């Protein structure tokens, strides 16, 4: 059981990255699967999380409509498409299965409110760098509305 | 509209063979929030692992120094006879609504030699 993220490194403010995800070794197309981040030296971030059809992707208050989740079963594969990138943005972004949410929908679809869940499988993480190569004065951040 | 906070200490030390205990407090949180609570250990490095889930079920291959309560309140997690390799940092996470994850901010436990 594996995952491996992809598509990190540098990006210019206001820029855009996709992040893909491999996954291996267990039923992909019936779990629901997360991007979690984490900026340096700081906490774990819930993204958002996708169902086995992508008629559910959900999403943390601070993403305002700028990232989308994606999926493509049969390639096994998980995408984070991210546009209008800040430095509030720059961090480790982890691919995450729920793998607890399986032993009770085994299809992935229903979107029930607070079911059981469990972040059992997570990726190495891959880097997000939104820089100009200036200090943290050179950095922008959210204008507030949405 | 106010969504569920989880809060844990910043910070707690302890020494081999002690037992310590990493709370996680919510606002805007109910019981269901500590029903569904799972918690994250992360190693210097290391990628994070789930080490307890369901308020207090315990996967397989995580050892059985992990366990973890809850109550209406809070969430828990206790570290038995703790070694050198418990220093990591630990978050736990739930529901911050029925569609959203939020986890803590994270407890870095410091094992002290």
């Known amino acids: 059981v594996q995952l491996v993220e992809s598509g990190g490194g540098l990006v210019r403010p206001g820029g855009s990255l996709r992040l893909s995800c491999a996954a291996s070794?267990?039923?992909?197309?019936?779990?629901?699967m997360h991007w979690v981040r984490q900026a340096p030296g700081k906490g774990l971030v819930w993204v958002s999380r996708i169902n086995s059809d992508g008629s559910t992707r959900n999403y943390a208050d601070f993403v305002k409509g700028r990232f989308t989740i994606s999926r493509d079963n049969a390639e096994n594969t998980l995408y984070l498409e991210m546009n209008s990138l800040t430095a509030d943005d720059t961090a480790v972004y982890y691919c995450?299965?729920?793998?607890?949410?399986?032993?009770?929908?085994?299809?992935?679809?229903?979107?029930?409110?607070?079911?059981?869940?469990?972040?059992?499988?997570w990726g190495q993480g891959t880097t997000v760098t939104v820089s100009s190569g200036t200090g943290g004065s050179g950095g922008g951040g959210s204008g507030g509305g949405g | 509209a106010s969504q569920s906070v989880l809060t844990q200490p910043v910070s707690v030390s302890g020494s081999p063979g002690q037992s310590i205990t990493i709370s996680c407090t919510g606002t805007?949180?109910?019981?269901?929030?500590?029903?569904?609570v799972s918690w994250y250990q992360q190693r210097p490095g290391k990628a994070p692992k789930l080490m307890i889930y369901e308020g207090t079920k315990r996967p397989s291959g995580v050892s059985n120094r992990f366990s973890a309560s809850k109550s209406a309140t809070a969430a828990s997690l206790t570290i038995s006879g703790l070694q050198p390799e418990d220093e990591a940092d630990y978050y736990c996470?739930?529901?911050?609504?029925?569609?959203?994850?939020?986890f803590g901010g994270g407890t870095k436990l410091t094992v002290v030699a």
């Open positions: 070794g267990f039923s992909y197309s019936n779990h629901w």
């Open positions: 805007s949180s109910n019981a269901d929030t500590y029903n569904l």
């Open positions: 996470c739930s529901y911050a609504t029925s569609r959203t994850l939020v």
């Open positions: 995450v299965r729920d793998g607890v949410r399986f032993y009770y929908d085994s299809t992935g679809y229903y979107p029930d409110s607070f079911f059981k869940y469990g972040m059992d499988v």
